[PDB]
Design a protein around this ligand. Structure first.
Ligand SMILES: Nc1ncnc2c1ncn2[C@@H]1O[C@H](COP(=O)(O)OP(=O)(O)O)[C@@H](O)[C@H]1O
Ligand SMILES: [Mg+2]
Ligand SMILES: [Mg+2]
Ligand SMILES: [Mg+2]
Length: 1281
């Protein structure tokens, strides 16, 4: 009542292979199911009626997706929808499109999947088993009628505040509320609340208690990290935090901000910061320092319960940290980490794996690594930051460690998300908060998320994107940046972030509950104030900047509300206009009143640990097992799921070389689109070492970070800055003393001796899982797990080395920082034979580690290196194998000098690595290494050689010999199997099988023109700069680098949001060129690019503006990725486009981020003039790029008209539909088409991301500044005259 639900049937929902996985899942559980069929169905909750025309508009918005075989329903209906009381992100984004298409009648759109199942035996018991399989019990519910969906839209009345009756019952009322509300309060904290409230003479409200309990938890007060310690009977002088701070006291160098914000900041470089001016809308370079922020976060517990949103909001919360650094900043690139228990992939179990069971309430390791990476990548992709480095460890074994024989592993996973961003010098310091400052929530209408449903998070990355654009508009105003103060909303929701915001400014605040934006009107005041809804920030802004701030938000379509005022009195007030009362009324010192410090009085446990039993170990069997341990094995399933080219500033991504092998040891970005200065990121971690030796695990993490970053041009080691993220089972015998010792080992010792700061860190301190298996208690406990992320300013992005071997005359030299210790404890080798072993690796000599770093820096600067790969998991064996994989070559090595224990020489995980040098440079490089005190560690191994032979000799004996292709295919099998069970198995198999064909020549180039002839230069030289409209919808993310590419070609790039067109601020009549940029407009909901296009079509004024533009005789338009999608959906407005295809879900059913080989084909395209017959790699980054025609008649007609402009080719140079050479399954390799007149071109790949040579993942050595793709932008300039 007050609202009607309309049901609108959508398109078929599951491809054939997905239907076959279902049918087969049913046959495997003995459910005789003749057939299954699925159809999306949509639900529109309307506040007013739709006329015949709006009805048709709504119907048309809800036609999208691949044109799959439609069937008429039969059998039993099971409809799967979100759980009632829940609103999906699909709903947020779809309803938004509805509103921007003028359908204000729509209150909410929601979507379900209708399953039509013919089975016909099946007891009601078995139907519950069918129902179970079709849905996720943590997010969804199953219904029997389409009608039942009305349950999703029930309007609820605001629930009132509840007082806890301390006055009337005494202390028992606090104890009862402590249990009922789950406050987890300690006795001394119940004491405090009793005293504080007895003094005020009134009962506490529920909200006030909940706020207090959120603020005084472990994760939030960091009680363990500030604790005093007593260890083996001796009081210790320093807390853990103090020992971390010791690194900043010792090395403050280059540090701009540390421990005073939710990211750290270091000095960057002076470069062209590129953005649109507030007054002109023109993009310009602003020559100024771009300083570098860094942060790394975890999101471990949620990910155990619901991994997709758990990982996604892991990234999302950390991106908010970055944006809310100082007075606003811009995230640039990200990193991702997973640690989980054994994967045990069905049909692919490995000999070290044993099922130990798990709690019913958590998902398996395999579920985490299936859905979690897709979740992390969904936020990074739809937000728009490249994910360029990461780690993925598996560990689960019964082991004789510090507390005797017990199960150690990661049933509670590590889910790690971090990254770097840029910030202006003047915004690094947070400002003062003036009295009467407006206090604002920027971002999403809130719901009851986080209050085991309360650990199920929810991500809407496009909402966050819209918020970032506002934040960007604010810092881009320089001295006029209206942001006085900004902070992210995370744990505790507003009940933490608003008090933290006023409190860091020395203020109080008065707030109004009913000013806060909400999508559940039923929520209690406690739910409104304490819920952990996502994509929110809190800021302060002066009252007189509010009109400005409103103009900025409205142009971005970023929702915001003013919810209160900052006060001089240090009081916290929260009024409720609906119930005319005051849920919160407290002094801030009472809320933020602290109880005493914690003292931990603890004892050292140290494991004895036994020698590696080698009975079943051969070097050959060990090579095979080690390459099948997911920690070692190829990571493609984690890398290609995320964009790696967004921004146009990525110099080094995971994938290396012509054969695009994911082994890059660190990530590198350019600082700007006009510099070779940059930033670098690397990770070091070695948790299983902590099962033998806590200090050594931490030291090795520091050292690996350094070895992974070392072939990058940095200089001074003091440029390198660390995040230290600590994961422990605090309280588990031996760990606490372990934690203190490991923090000491890096904070007090190693990092200060090296000159390394740790200005940021986090901790997560209950890394264990307890459950009942038989009548038995069971425990899985993590090792102490330090993850070090290293971050650095880069002097020259171009000088970076990769593991890609050259086959020119060369020498392979090992730098064995293990000094022949050759430890085998807690290695991959031991793990893969179910053992812990004796003695682990460690940092053997700090001077020599420093010496290594400085020596690598001298060799990099002087260009003496052809390649570098450090030694980590899997030892020298893996290092050499991976270099041979990346170089598509052989290796001939001798290990006689590495000791008689050949297994230990190859498989120790001591620090160091293999450099490759030119043969003629060998002597000079050995002399240089000797000057840094290293002669003793440096060992000539042999050479890289053309071919397929991987050979390891010792004197006259062959220690190990195998085909390099055979090793490379074994190392691939983990990612193959993961892709097989997650993606379309046909694609997974084609990708895998192409690795086995050694003749694959890899990416290679043929150019039909001179890539250095700047054909636009005569035009640029006149000083006349035509405008191009760089068109962007909400969710677009590639506009900045697109602008920069047109800029290099001599245009004035103007920023045109769709809101500028809708509001009449820009007219396309003033432009001769237009480009629709890439991204995830509306998060691709209702089809990639559809919302964007249909919002143009359904507005008749704007529709007419586009049509007029395209119907002019000389205008040019380009659509790229999302933009191509958009323009393919606007096709009725574009002359000569009648044969154009649609673009739909990739055949792989996976987001594909590839460096793909294409060829330019003959077509009218004016943007491709001079390039025809050229073949070169381009950045590709999409999930809905598959060309779909309506039938073969459409395809032939398209082809015979000569309108295809780009095709995917394999590395042999033939047009292909084989994956991933053709990443999406497009017929005849098609990824670009033009119009009959050549004036409009649309393409899925991103030329604007790779117009700079430095930003191509692989490129030929001889190229200059400009890639081949720079010709497009220049062709645009020349054509305009
Ligand atoms: N979880 C992940 N997400 C994204 N990239 C990852 C992930 N795990 C590993 N990678 C990338 O895969 C490559 C190989 O990883 P790994 O063998 O763990 O690195 P290393 O041994 O050099 O520390 C690297 O380029 C790394 O950055
Ligand atoms: Mg590795
Ligand atoms: Mg490495
Ligand atoms: Mg590593």
């Amino acid at each position: 009542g007050s609202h009607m639900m309309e049901i609108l049937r959508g398109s078929p929902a599951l491809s054939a292979f997905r239907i076959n996985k279902l049918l087969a899942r049913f046959q495997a559980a003995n459910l005789q199911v003749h057939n299954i069929y699925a159809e999306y169905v949509h639900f529109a909750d309307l506040n007013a009626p739709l006329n015949d025309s709006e009805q048709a508009q709504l119907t048309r918005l809800l036609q999208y997706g691949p044109a799959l075989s439609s069937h008429t329903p039969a059998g039993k209906l099971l409809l799967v929808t979100p759980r009632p009381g829940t609103i999906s992100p699909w709903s947020s984004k779809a309803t938004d499109i509805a509103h921007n298409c003028g359908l204000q009648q729509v209150d909410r759109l929601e979507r379900g999947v209708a399953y039509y199942i013919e089975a016909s035996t099946l007891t009601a018991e078995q139907w519950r088993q069918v129902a179970a399989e079709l849905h996720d019990r943590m997010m969804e519910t199953v219904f029997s009628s389409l009608t039942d969906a009305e349950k999703l839209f029930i309007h609820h009345q605001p629930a009132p505040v509840s007082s806890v009756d301390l006055l009337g019952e005494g202390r028992q009322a606090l104890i009862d509320a402590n249990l009922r509300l789950g406050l987890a309060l300690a006795e001394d904290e119940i004491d405090y609340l009793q005293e504080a409230f007895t003094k005020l003479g009134r009962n506490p409200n529920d909200i006030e208690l909940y706020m207090f309990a959120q603020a005084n938890s472990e994760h939030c007060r960091h009680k363990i990290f500030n604790a005093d310690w007593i260890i083996d009977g001796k009081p210790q002088p320093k807390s853990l935090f103090k020992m971390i701070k010791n690194t900043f006291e010792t090395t403050p160098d280059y540090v701009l901000s540390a421990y005073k914000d939710n990211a750290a900041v270091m000095e960057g470089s002076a470069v062209g910061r590129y953005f649109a001016d507030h007054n002109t809308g023109r993009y310009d370079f602003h020559q100024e320092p771009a300083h570098i922020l860094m942060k790394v976060e975890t999101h471990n517990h949620p990910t155990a319960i619901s991994p997709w949103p758990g990982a996604a909001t892991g990234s999302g919360g950390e991106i908010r940290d970055e944006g809310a650094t100082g007075r606003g900043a811009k995230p640039k690139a990200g990193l991702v980490g997973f640690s989980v228990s054994n994967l045990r992939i069905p049909g692919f179990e490995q000999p070290w794996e044993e099922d130990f069971g798990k709690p019913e309430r958590i998902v398996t390791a395999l579920d985490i690594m299936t859905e979690g990476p897709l979740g992390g990548a969904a936020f990074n992709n739809e937000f728009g930051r490249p994910a360029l480095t990461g780690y993925f460890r598996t560990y689960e074994e019964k082991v004789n460690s510090h507390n005797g024989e017990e199960l150690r592993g990661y049933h509670k996973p590590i889910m790690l998300a971090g990254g770097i961003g840029n910030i202006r010098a003047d915004h690094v310091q947070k400002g003062e908060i003036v009295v009467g400052a407006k206090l604002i929530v920027l971002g999403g209408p809130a719901m009851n998320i986080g209050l085991d449903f309360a650990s199920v998070q929810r991500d809407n990355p496009e909402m966050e994107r819209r918020c970032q654009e506002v934040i960007d508009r604010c810092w881009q105003l320089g001295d006029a940046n209206p942001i006085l103060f900004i902070h992210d909303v995370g744990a505790g929701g507003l009940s933490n972030a608003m008090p933290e915001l006023v409190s860091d400014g020395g203020r109080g605040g008065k707030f109004e509950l009913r000013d806060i934006l909400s999508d559940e009107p039923g929520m209690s005041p406690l739910e409104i104030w304490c819920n952990e809804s996502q994509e929110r920030y809190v800021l302060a802004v002066a009252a007189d900047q509010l009109p400005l701030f409103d103009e900025l938000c409205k142009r971005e379509r970023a929702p915001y509300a003013v919810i209160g005022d900052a006060t001089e009195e240090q009081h916290l007030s929260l009024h409720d206009n609906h119930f005319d009362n005051q849920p919160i009324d407290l002094p801030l010192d009472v809320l933020l009143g602290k109880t005493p410090k914690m003292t931990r009085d603890v004892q050292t446990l140290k494991a004895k640990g036994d020698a590696l039993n080698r009975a079943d170990i051969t070097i050959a069997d060990a090579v095979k097992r080690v390459l099948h341990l997911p920690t070692v094995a190829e990571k493609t399933f984690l890398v290609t799921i995320g964009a790696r080219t967004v921004t146009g500033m990525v110099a080094r991504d995971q994938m290396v070389g012509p054969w695009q092998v994911p082994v890059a040891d660190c990530a590198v970005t350019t600082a700007s689109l006009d510099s070779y200065y940059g930033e670098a990121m690397s990770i070091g971690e070695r948790a299983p070492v902590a099962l033998l030796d806590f200090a050594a695990s931490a030291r090795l993490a520091v050292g690996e970070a350094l070895t992974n970053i070392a072939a990058t041009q940095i200089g001074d080691i003091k440029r390198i800055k660390l995040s230290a993220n600590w994961m422990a089972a605090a309280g588990h015998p031996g760990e606490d003393a372990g934690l203190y010792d490991a923090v000491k080992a890096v904070g007090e010792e190693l990092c200060p001796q090296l000159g390394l700061t740790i200005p940021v860190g986090k901790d997560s301190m209950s890394m264990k899982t307890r459950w009942q298996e038989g009548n038995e208690q069971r425990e899985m406990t993590s090792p102490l797990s330090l993850v070090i992320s290293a971050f650095a300013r880069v002097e020259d992005v171009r000088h970076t080395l990769t593991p890609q071997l050259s086959t020119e005359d060369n020498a392979l030299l090992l730098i064995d920082l293990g000094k022949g210790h050759n430890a085998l404890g807690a290695t991959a080798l031991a793990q893969v034979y179910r053992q812990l072993g004796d003695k682990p690796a460690d940092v053997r000599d700090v001077a020599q580690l420093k010496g290594f770093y400085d020596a690598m820096q001298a060799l990099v600067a002087a260009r003496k290196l052809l390649a570098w790969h450090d030694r980590s998991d899997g030892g020298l064996l893996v290092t050499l194998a991976e270099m041979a994989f990346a170089g598509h070559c052989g290796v001939q090595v001798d290990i006689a000098a590495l000791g008689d224990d050949h297994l230990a020489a190859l498989f120790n995980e001591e620090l160091g690595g293999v450099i490759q040098v030119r043969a003629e440079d060998r002597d000079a490089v050995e002399a240089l290494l000797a000057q840094y005190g290293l002669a003793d560690c440096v060992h000539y191994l042999g050479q890289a050689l053309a071919g397929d032979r991987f050979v390891i000799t010792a004197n006259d004996q062959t220690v190990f010999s195998e085909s390099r292709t055979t090793l490379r295919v074994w190392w691939a099998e983990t990612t193959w199997q993961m892709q097989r069970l997650r993606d379309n198995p046909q694609c997974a198999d084609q990708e895998h099988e192409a690795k086995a064909n050694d003749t694959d020549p890899g990416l290679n180039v043929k150019l039909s023109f001179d890539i250095n002839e700047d054909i636009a230069a005569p035009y640029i030289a006149t000083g006349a700069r035509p405008k191009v409209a760089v068109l962007r919808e909400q969710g677009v993310n590639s506009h900045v680098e697109m602008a920069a590419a047109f800029h290099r070609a001599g245009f004035d790039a103007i920023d045109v949001h769709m809101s500028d067109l809708l509001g009449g601020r820009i007219g396309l009549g003033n432009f001769h060129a237009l480009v629709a940029c890439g991204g995830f407009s509306y998060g691709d909901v209702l089809g990639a690019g559809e919302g964007w296009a249909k919002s143009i079509l359904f507005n008749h004024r704007v529709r007419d503006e586009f049509e007029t533009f395209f119907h002019r005789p000389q205008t040019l338009a380009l659509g790229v990725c999302n933009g191509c999608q958009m323009m393919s959906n606007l096709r009725e407005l574009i002359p000569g486009s009648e044969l154009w295809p649609r673009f739909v879900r990739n055949h792989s059913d996976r987001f594909e981020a590839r460096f793909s080989l294409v060829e330019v084909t003959q077509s009218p395209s004016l943007l491709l003039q001079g390039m025809v017959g050229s073949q070169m790699p381009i950045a590709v980054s999409h999930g809905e790029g598959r060309v779909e025609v309506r039938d073969d008649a459409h395809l032939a007609a398209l082809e015979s008209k000569g309108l295809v402009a780009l095709r995917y080719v394999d590395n042999f140079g033939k047009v292909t539909e084989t994956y991933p050479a053709n990443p999406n399954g497009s017929p005849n390799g098609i990824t670009a088409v033009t119009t009959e007149n050549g004036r409009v071109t649309i393409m899925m790949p991103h030329p604007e991301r790779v117009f700079r040579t430095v930003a191509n993942s692989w490129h030929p050595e001889n190229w200059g500044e400009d890639s081949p793709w720079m010709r497009i932008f220049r062709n645009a300039r020349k054509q305009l005259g």
